Design a protein around this nucleic acid. Sequence first.
RNA 1: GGAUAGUGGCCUACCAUGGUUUCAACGGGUAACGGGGAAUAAGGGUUCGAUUCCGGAGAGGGAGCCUGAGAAACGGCUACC
RNA 2: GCGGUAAUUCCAGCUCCAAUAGCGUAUAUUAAAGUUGUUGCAGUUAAAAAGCUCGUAGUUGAACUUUGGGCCCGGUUGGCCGGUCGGAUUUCCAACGGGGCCUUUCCUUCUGGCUAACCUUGAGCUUGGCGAACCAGGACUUUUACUUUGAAAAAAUUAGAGUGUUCAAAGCAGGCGUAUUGCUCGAAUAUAUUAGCAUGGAAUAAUAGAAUAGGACGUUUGGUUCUAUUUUGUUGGUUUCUAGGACCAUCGUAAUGAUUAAUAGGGACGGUCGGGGGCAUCAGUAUUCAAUUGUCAGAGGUGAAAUUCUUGGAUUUAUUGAAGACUAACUACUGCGAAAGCAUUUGCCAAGGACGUUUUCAUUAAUCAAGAACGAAAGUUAGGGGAUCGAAGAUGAUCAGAUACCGUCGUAGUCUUAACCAUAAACUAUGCCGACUAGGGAUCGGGUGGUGUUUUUUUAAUGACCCACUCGGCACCUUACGAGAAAUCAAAGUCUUUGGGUUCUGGGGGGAGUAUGGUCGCAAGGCUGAAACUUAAAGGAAUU
RNA 3: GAUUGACCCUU
Lengths: 129, 150, 144, 81
Amino acid sequence: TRSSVLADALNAINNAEKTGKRQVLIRPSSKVIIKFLQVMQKHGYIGEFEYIDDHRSGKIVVQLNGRLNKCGVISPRFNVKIGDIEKWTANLLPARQFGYVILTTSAGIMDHEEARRKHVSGKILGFVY
Amino acid sequence: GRMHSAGKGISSSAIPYSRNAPAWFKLSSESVIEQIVKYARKGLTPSQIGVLLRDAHGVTQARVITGNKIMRILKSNGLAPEIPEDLYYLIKKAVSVRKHLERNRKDKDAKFRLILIESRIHRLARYYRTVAVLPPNWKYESATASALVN
Amino acid sequence: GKGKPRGLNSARKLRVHRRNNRWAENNYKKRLLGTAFKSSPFGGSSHAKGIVLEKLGIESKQPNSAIRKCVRVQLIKNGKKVTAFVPNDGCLNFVDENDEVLLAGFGRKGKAKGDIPGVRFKVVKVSGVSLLALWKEKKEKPRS
Amino acid sequence: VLVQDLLHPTAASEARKHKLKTLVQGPRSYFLDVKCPGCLNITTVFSHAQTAVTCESCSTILCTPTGGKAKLSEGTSFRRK
RNA sequence: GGAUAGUGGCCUACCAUGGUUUCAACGGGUAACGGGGAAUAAGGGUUCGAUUCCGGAGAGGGAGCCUGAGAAACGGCUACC
RNA sequence: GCGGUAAUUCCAGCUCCAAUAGCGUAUAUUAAAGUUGUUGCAGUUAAAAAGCUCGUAGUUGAACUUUGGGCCCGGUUGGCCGGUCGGAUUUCCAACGGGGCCUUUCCUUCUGGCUAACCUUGAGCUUGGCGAACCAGGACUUUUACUUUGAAAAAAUUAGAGUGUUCAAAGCAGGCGUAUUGCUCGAAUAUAUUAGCAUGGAAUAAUAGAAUAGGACGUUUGGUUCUAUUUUGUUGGUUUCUAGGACCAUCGUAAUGAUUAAUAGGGACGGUCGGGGGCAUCAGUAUUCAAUUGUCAGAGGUGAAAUUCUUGGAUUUAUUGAAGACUAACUACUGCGAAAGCAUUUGCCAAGGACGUUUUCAUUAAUCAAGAACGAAAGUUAGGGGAUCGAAGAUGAUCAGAUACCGUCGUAGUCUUAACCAUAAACUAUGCCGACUAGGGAUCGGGUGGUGUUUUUUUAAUGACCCACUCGGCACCUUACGAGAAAUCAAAGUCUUUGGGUUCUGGGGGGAGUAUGGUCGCAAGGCUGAAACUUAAAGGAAUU
RNA sequence: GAUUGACCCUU
């Protein structure tokens, strides 16, 4: 059954990106999905996205560009400390100058560099680059 | 889908977006309630009450016409079945299959389908016991089921 | 899902699966069963002394035809009989009778080396004097 | 295709799609007010009846249930609702 | 209640099948004293740790005890192989 | 791999190559080993997807509840500021967890002591309205997991402000006088998983609230329990809102009071569909064999042939009858079933998928150790049946031999009834569930629609076909988006740009599916299942 | 669709 809604969203985005399509449809539009897409938006990795409101769970239409190389999800949501953030970034980022390991912390969902700037940690969600 | 089959059929009602519907319906919510309770007294399950309200009369759904759904209405007005309708129908089907097997021992297909139906019964009954709409230690037994249905 | 469980509480499943699948490794199974201390001829030891017993009608592997000797040796701590290969030219001078010879493995952790079938050990010392010392004539076996 | 407006698709394509495969899924069924010739007896019946729907007046069943849509009786006037 | 320096089935009289267990109890094995700790990585680490420091145990094995603040002490006693 | 009367490999003459007071060996262990794989392996064909389903533990599990708008700070730039020949920070308008305000959005009773962020101008650090930023007592972080801050791995390490033991490994030494004096820096910085502590935080996952109200406040309201802090003469004692609380009546307040209904799942209903299954039981020819007159000498078999039957009539032809089996042509890249499997009619019995639904429930779900249901053929125990074919066997032939292939017979078996068995190249050699990715000729079950054809009335109507075309199936058709070792694969893709959930299995070849111990079986055997030892390949795609 | 069985030495 549908286990990871965020993983399904990220996989759909990746497949549309690789196919070249300028837009992608996502179901069923979780809040974690919205926050992940907001992080990608802030770092310029997608562009715009719309929340279609069917009363069940919502859908998302994301306008993509050519910039996203790979958006992914780390399942399970591993507990990550300040010590472990460098571990994860050097494990699953192309370089140390771009790309963000995204994690849900006590101060909401953010990327690893903002997590360091806020000196907080949490559970790893995924990554974008 | 089809927990006990290989079928992948997607076939379900397309619930409308409008929760306050349908603006050609000029009957009262209390009137729909009273039709519901008269049907429940007549001895219909919520599935049949809803199908008749939707078909013989113009009622898109009791949820959007009155303040709640049919099972909630019946539980509020005291017409609650002792066991839920789906569990009752599953038990009825299992009782039917067991009576069939008793005459037809060699029906291995019926034996397999009886195992499937009883697994469904036990899973649904465990859910009902967990939510506490069934009493604790409530158990489906083959001998007791025949009297429990009829 | 790539097979293996991935849940955050599946650590017990992962550990037990790894414990079960360690046994497929040749060296882990030997180490955890103690096959060196129960059925290895040397009892898990690097070297072993022995008394050379007799001659046996054995034949070398490919390619040759050489039936002169290959030392059958009875170990002292185990009492087991193993065939050892005298590792140099001129094997005749050192196999006189009932000598005490020190044996090492052939280097393959319990397997035959080359064209010698069924021999897993070699001789390094003959009655306390080194075999290649005798081979190079730089030391003399005790003749009195 | 490469670029298309999923937010605002054409009504032709949306009607062509399955009822659950649209942006917001909605029922492709409908209701109709049916009147038998003679007595008006205005009753509203669902298109997919699954029921031999008749008024309590007399033996004037208005539909016969089928696999999908209900085939209305020969002498009957329907009005889409 | 007794015995302890003290709690406590540590043992004595009556009252239950109570307690543990696939989240692995119980049993068997260890060529198992435990820990601090060598050998690699910003994370794969796999082995080893009898052994200089700390905690245990033993003084051929079991058992018993005197003195003594402190010992079941064995370079202290009392009993076999 | 070298050596088989021309050895760059043996034993010697050899530059003595390489390391060097060291170097070579053996065993174990480590990296290489992504050949243990959480990171991070592999399972169509190289070893490996359990035969197929159910199911408990375990693992995992749709979305939803406070979201956004305005002023002030220790604390990030090249700094017209060059005031100190790069610590010098004002208009600093390029950003912030946290302390305060409005936005329906407050930092726990009720009684006090410093007298609580202050209603209280003493001609220029204040006598009383409200508490938690210490203390008093009833109360709540209903419960976590999680995540920065301090004893936490008591002792040497990790690099050191520095240090000449001949430099260095090392220990912690050491360094400077107006040299008769004497003085002195320093031996700290990372905690070696998990655990218990105190602390801030709320994202990430909730059984908990209140629903057949024994739900929340009521300074307004009349009735039962332990201390009496107000005293008359004393450590016992009585009474008017009690300080620490248990039912009462809504005169008595709050929008009293249930998140969607997931192209998740279950259930109901509707018309269908299917060679899905079980029973009573119908039919079809064929095969074999029997009841009759006719017929003639061959006939059935093989690559020429011969055990064979045959003028007491064989084969061939009657009209038939009996038995048992099977269900041909229709029959297909077609259907149904979890697989095994299932193909003559009618009826009955229950079941099932797909579709349709503006029905109902509401997360009931996915996969699954133990535990179970079914499970081709062969086989086993009995009873039926016993036509055909036919392991065994009999027998003729070819043959060097033929107890094989080929020919004719032929027990067991093949068919059923009860009971076992539980295996298969049980195969798609491809686990299940969920999502997403060039395009199509087609097909099966449904089948939104198109005033498109026939008997009836060519001038309403209940057929069926033809075309758009959704949905769910069995499959197919051309580079590669991609994958792969390739063959090839729309999955075997979305895997070094490596994590959706979950079960099972494999770790070079053999020994060996053996031994042994269990366990099931009447047995045959099934399931679990090794080591010793041996071995350098064995294997996977056919490139010439 | 007959009888064609076998063939000791290295990359």
